[PDB]
């Protein structure tokens, strides 16, 4: 059983089993449920070692790789608690011009995007969200919408 990328793991804090996906970095307590194109939105947090350390949000991005991951982790927490919607955080805080479209990148096939982004995107099922996804652009949260 278990769809591509998914494995079982042991919770250190609680001792209960959980499920993790080494392609998307998703993790959840619940046991989880190839197309030519997928459609995804993302939220990007850049850092000082990004291929290009600037965005519409700030001309010189100075945060560390570690501080970017903490920001990503907090947004995932907010999304999973329902305190904030993915689209609302992407629109406010994503370091990419796709923020203006609620993070939507449109449809794409394999062979177009950065490879880690592509692999995570195609390993999500429609409606699912990734964990932190690392590319030279920075750290992404990816939501598969189609």
Curated annotation (Swiss-Prot):
Domain WW: 1-33
One Pfam family per UniProt: WW
Keywords, alphabetical: Acetylation, Cell cycle, Cytoplasm, Isomerase, Nucleus, Phosphoprotein, Rotamase
SMART domains according to UniProt: WW (SM00456)
Catalytic activity: [protein]-peptidylproline (omega=180) = [protein]-peptidylproline (omega=0)
Transmembrane segments: none
Cell compartments where the protein resides: Nucleus; Nucleus speckle; Cytoplasm
PTM sites of type Phosphoserine: 54, 91
EC number: 5.2.1.8
InterPro entries: PPIase_dom_sf, PPIase_Pin1, PPIase_PpiC, PPIase_PpiC_CS, WW_dom, WW_dom_sf
Note on domains (UniProt): The WW domain is required for the interaction with STIL and KIF20B.
Assembly and binders: Interacts with STIL. Interacts with KIF20B. Interacts with NEK6. Interacts (via WW domain) with PRKX. Interacts with BTK. Interacts (via PpiC domain) with DAPK1. Interacts with the phosphorylated form of RAF1. Interacts (via WW domain) with ATCAY; upon NGF stimulation. Interacts with PML (isoform PML-4). Interacts with BCL6. Interacts with FBXW7, disrupting FBXW7 dimerization and promoting FBXW7 autoubiquitination and degradation. Directly interacts with RBBP8/CtIP; this interaction depends upon RBBP8 phosphorylation.
This protein's name: Peptidyl-prolyl cis-trans isomerase NIMA-interacting 1
Taxonomy of the source species: Eukaryota, Metazoa, Chordata, Craniata, Vertebrata
Gene responsible for this protein: PIN1
């Amino acid at each position: 059983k278990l769809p591509p990328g998914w494995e079982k793991a042991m919770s250190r804090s609680s001792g209960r089993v959980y499920y993790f996906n080494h392609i998307t970095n998703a993790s959840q307590w619940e046991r989880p449920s190839e197309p030519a194109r997928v459609r995804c939105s993302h939220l990007l947090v850049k850092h000082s070692q990004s291929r290009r350390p600037s965005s519409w949000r700030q001309e010189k991005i100075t945060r560390t790789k570690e501080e970017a991951l903490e920001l990503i982790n907090g947004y995932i927490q907010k999304i999973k608690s329902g305190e904030e919607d993915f689209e609302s955080l992407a629109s406010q805080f994503s370091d990419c011009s796709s923020a203006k479209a609620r993070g939507d990148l449109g449809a794409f096939s394999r062979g177009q995007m950065q490879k880690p982004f592509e692999d995570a995107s195609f390993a999500l099922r429609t409606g699912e969200m990734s964990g932190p996804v690392f590319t030279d652009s920075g750290i992404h949260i990816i939501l598969r919408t189609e």
